[PDB]
Design a protein that fits this description.
part of a larger assembly, 4 chains, A alpha+beta (303), B alpha+beta (290), C mainly alpha (98), A: 303 residues, alpha+beta, 4-stranded antiparallel β-sheet, 3-stranded antiparallel β-sheet, 7 helices, C: 98 residues, mainly alpha, 3 helices, Major capsid protein (chain C), Herpes_1 (chain B), DNA binding (chain B), host nucleus (chain B), capsid protein (chain B)
Chain lengths: 303, 290, 98, 292
């Protein structure tokens, strides 16, 4: 015997459709919440698909979702099984990028591009079974940086320079197959998720400026590590060695309200908490040996 | 269901016959193979076979060494498995006498050129490196079959002997005169900054500290010299963007009491090394810190 | 069908065929048992008068969970069955119009 | 020696009343930090109580617990205490102590207790001029707020006069969360908290240098042409009344170091999860968890 998670459907199943599940004997399946029974609506990432919400909303929900590999497809039932940490678990290479031995694979929400290519395997009446990409860790650090820069250029667009620079970020180039990352922007106006995220960096990028000035000058007096004196001049923010304009010291806040200065610090870290989901990529699998043709590979579970 | 199904003691696999024996017992066939006791049926440890060029067989032929994959800009080979000792010549931590010592052993048709792949790039070494584990049962050949240990204790087959990790003495350091009974191991790359190029050192740090917050704080003191170079390069070189004074990562844990100094002797050459004894493996992600 | 007179449209034979399908709705009953109640029901200590009493309650507690699980299986079978009929039952004013 | 034991027996040396021993049965599956790990531990070493100081600094108590090994309570007898070290990855069940909504699916981080709004606080246990103290397990969003405000208390004390600082502390000691008030046990500005600023103060200036010329202006770009609740509200919070460098090859790497400082700056308030809730009990007297 072994612990399992039954997941029966509801719509009638053609026998030919069950054979597409036989190709998915061992692949990652996100689950909104652990349960001993799960409706096929809850099954897959499709339950959280959204219209105006951007890619960030999927990643922010998927990180809380519990991963669960497929075990043994059968008749009306689905035998899902949750991996235990510290044990190896084979995973199907649903991910577009070929796996390499020893990489720290980590889940990311899917990013299907423009022209149609691979189709979703289960379009069972409006609902369809999308699956998150399985990607090596260094690329997952890369794809996250791409979408955020594209949101920084979500405002300006008419200039040709931004118009081309987004096209370069759109086209990733890596080992073996190359791919294209769809633009989060659509119909000029930005999606609300990227606007919430791009402002979260814009707050820290600017609110940190004036607020940190008073805190540098006082702590630097000790000259303990001595670096704080260099830190005081780090805030001038310039490249060229500017001459005799005579504000050699960084600009400092003035006439701030005694209580509002506390709230500005509260407005600082709160932006960091909303931004935190993009900041980190928890590992979920670590591949060891890889099967030929990269169809699948054994991966010890992590997290 | 019957109460016997829940009141029963958990099933002992040793009380059960081996699964290959069950198919034979049903038909009373007698194959030449002796399946009455499967070997390697009881191993918490996980392993993977690694085919490696013969030019890196040195030192690793003694069990216990930190394999680390190194992706390279060349598309073939895509992932050479550098020995940790082979990376020490790149390290500034190694003493100039120790650097000249081991380096003569590494001359080869392949390993001697392996160092060139490090110098060519602009990005920092940790972006290429990826910890794999530890050696056990080298095959020794023109294409040696190294067996990495992804997790669990190193040991000889059939539990005949517990292999020990070999940490070179120059990279080792202690955070306290009085160690705790437990202390996690942390491989660390440190990036001191200089004009033409960074010259990273390597460090392995057993420490009773386990929580990541308290772990990085003590490093901020001992490596404050390189930390001063880190901010100094930033004000010096706009457009240039150095990052991360170092990179901690979890590697495993040891009982501390078992540790004692030792030395490996390959090709009649002594090499003093710290020697963790019963060292379980618990690898983790690189964790950058500034 | 029915016969009709001359000068009128007739009624050619109209064979008709249809196929019903089936629905599904599995149920499940979690139930907890204290780890102490399991270890006392399993291992038996020295024949002290108190330990025999605690072993007796440990034995009866499992029957209290199993019989509760069985009665819950019947309550859910009635519940899932009535829930099945409610989806199949049209509102009455439609059946009256039909 | 042998690897530190998964199972630890603590035996109370002091005599205890027949009423108090039943409180341990209600205390089952509590999170009990221990100092040194050993197969058999004196009860004076047991609990958080020994680390208290006359300074009563909260910031140090928050730090010392993070180095301690947590051990879940299990199976109390007439004297024996069956502490059980939680090995990582297993699905442990954790009885709750401090009053909080919990709610399913939140991440958890152990923290020192924060006394409730009456200020009255009956001890969970007493035993001869010594009192057991179990640090509270709290949801991750709650832990981020209680931890960051202490850093706000330090930076605010660095400049303004001591009289204005103490009046601000009463505004900072309150923390509403899930319609439940809480208060810090004697927050203190101290050398233990002084280092919290210096690791932050260097962390702040690095973001100003890593910031792109567009990213600092990016909020001003939105206000110039658009308006919204978040835009107008943040505009009051900070700013006083085509890109020049289109370098995607630079920005792709310039942010890569900027993400490093965002990891380090968050880590001052971020802490490693100790448990991950699955299904809080409707009675809210127990919770389901994993991590370790």
């Amino acid at each position: 015997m072994e612990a399992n998670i039954f997941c029966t459907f509801d719509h009638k199943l053609s026998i030919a459709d069950v054979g597409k599940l036989t190709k998915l004997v061992a692949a990652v399946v996100p689950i909104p919440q652990r349960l001993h029974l799960i409706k096929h609506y809850q099954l897959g990432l499709h339950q959280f698909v959204d219209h105006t919400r951007g890619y960030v909303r999927l990643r922010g929900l998927l990180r809380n979702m519990t991963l669960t590999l497929m075990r043994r497809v059968e008749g009306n039932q689905i035998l899902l099984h949750v991996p235990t940490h510290g044990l190896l678990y084979t995973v199907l290479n649903t991910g577009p990028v070929t796996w390499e031995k020893g990489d720290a694979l980590c889940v990311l929400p899917p990013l299907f591009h423009g022209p149609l290519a691979r189709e979703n395997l289960l379009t069972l009446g409006q609902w369809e079974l999308v699956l998150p990409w399985i990607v090596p860790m260094p690329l997952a650090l890369e794809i996250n940086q791409r979408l955020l820069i594209m949101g920084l250029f979500s405002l300006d667009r008419s200039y040709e320079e931004v118009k081309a620079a987004v096209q370069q970020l759109q086209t990733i180039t890596f080992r073996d197959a190359t791919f294209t990352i769809p633009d989060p922007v659509i119909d000029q106006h930005l999606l609300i998720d990227m606007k919430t995220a791009c402002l979260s960096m814009s707050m820290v990028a600017n609110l940190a400026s004036e607020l940190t000035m008073t805190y540098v000058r006082k702590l630097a007096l000790e000259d303990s590590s001595m670096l704080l004196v260099k830190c005081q001049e780090l805030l001038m923010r310039l490249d060229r060695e500017r001459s005799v304009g005579e504000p050699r010291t960084p600009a400092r806040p003035q006439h701030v309200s005694p209580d509002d200065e506390i709230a500005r610090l509260s407005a600082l870290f709160v932006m960091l908490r909303q931004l935190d989901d993009l900041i980190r990529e928890q590992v979920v699998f670590t591949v060891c040996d890889v099967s030929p043709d990269n169809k699948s590979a054994t991966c010890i579970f992590k997290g | 269901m019957d109460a016997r199904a829940v009141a029963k003691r958990p099933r002992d696999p040793a009380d059960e016959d081996n699964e290959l024996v069950t198919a034979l017992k049903a038909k009373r066939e007698v194959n030449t193979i002796s399946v009455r006791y499967l070997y390697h049926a009881d191993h918490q440890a996980l392993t993977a076979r690694f085919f490696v060029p013969e030019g890196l067989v040195e030192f690793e032929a003694q069990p216990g060494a930190l394999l680390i994959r190194m992706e390279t800009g060349c598309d073939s080979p895509r992932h050479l498995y550098i020995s940790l000792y082979l990376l020490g010549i790149r390290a500034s931590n190694v003493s100039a006498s120790t650097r000249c010592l081991l380096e003569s052993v590494y001359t080869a048709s392949a390993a001697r050129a392996a160092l060139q792949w490090l110098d060519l790039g602009p990005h920092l070494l940790h972006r290429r490196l990826e910890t794999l584990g530890c050696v056990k049962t080298v095959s020794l050949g023109i294409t040696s079959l190294l067996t990495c240990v992804m997790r669990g204790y190193l040991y000889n087959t059939l539990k005949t002997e517990v292999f020990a990790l070999m940490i070179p003495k120059d990279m080792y350091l202690t955070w306290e005169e009085t160690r705790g009974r437990l202390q996690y191991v942390y491989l660390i790359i440190v990036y001191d900054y200089d004009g033409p190029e960074t010259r990273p050192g390597i460090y392995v740090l057993t420490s009773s500290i386990a929580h990541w917050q308290t772990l990085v704080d003590v490093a901020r003191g001992k490596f404050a010299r390189e930390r001063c170079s880190f901010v100094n390069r930033r004000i010096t070189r706009p457009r240039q963007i150095p990052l991360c004074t170092g990179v901690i990562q979890k590697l495993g844990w040891c009982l501390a009491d078992d540790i004692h100094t030792s030395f490996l002797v390959h090709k009649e050459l002594k090499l003093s090394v710290v020697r963790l004894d019963n060292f379980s493996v618990e690898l983790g992600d690189f964790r950058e810190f500034v | 069908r029915v016969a009709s007179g001359a000068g009128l449209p007739t009624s050619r034979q109209t064979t008709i065929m249809v196929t019903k399908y089936s629905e599904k709705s599995p149920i499940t009953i979690p139930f907890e048992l204290s780890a102490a109640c399991l270890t006392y029901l399993r291992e038996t200590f020295e024949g002290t008068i108190l330990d025999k009493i605690l072993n007796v309650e440990a034995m009866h507690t499992v029957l209290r969970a199993l019989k509760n699980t069985a009665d819950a299986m019947e309550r859910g079978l009635i519940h899932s069955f009535l829930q099945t009929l409610l989806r199949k039952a049209p509102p009455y004013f439609v059946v009256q119009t039909l």
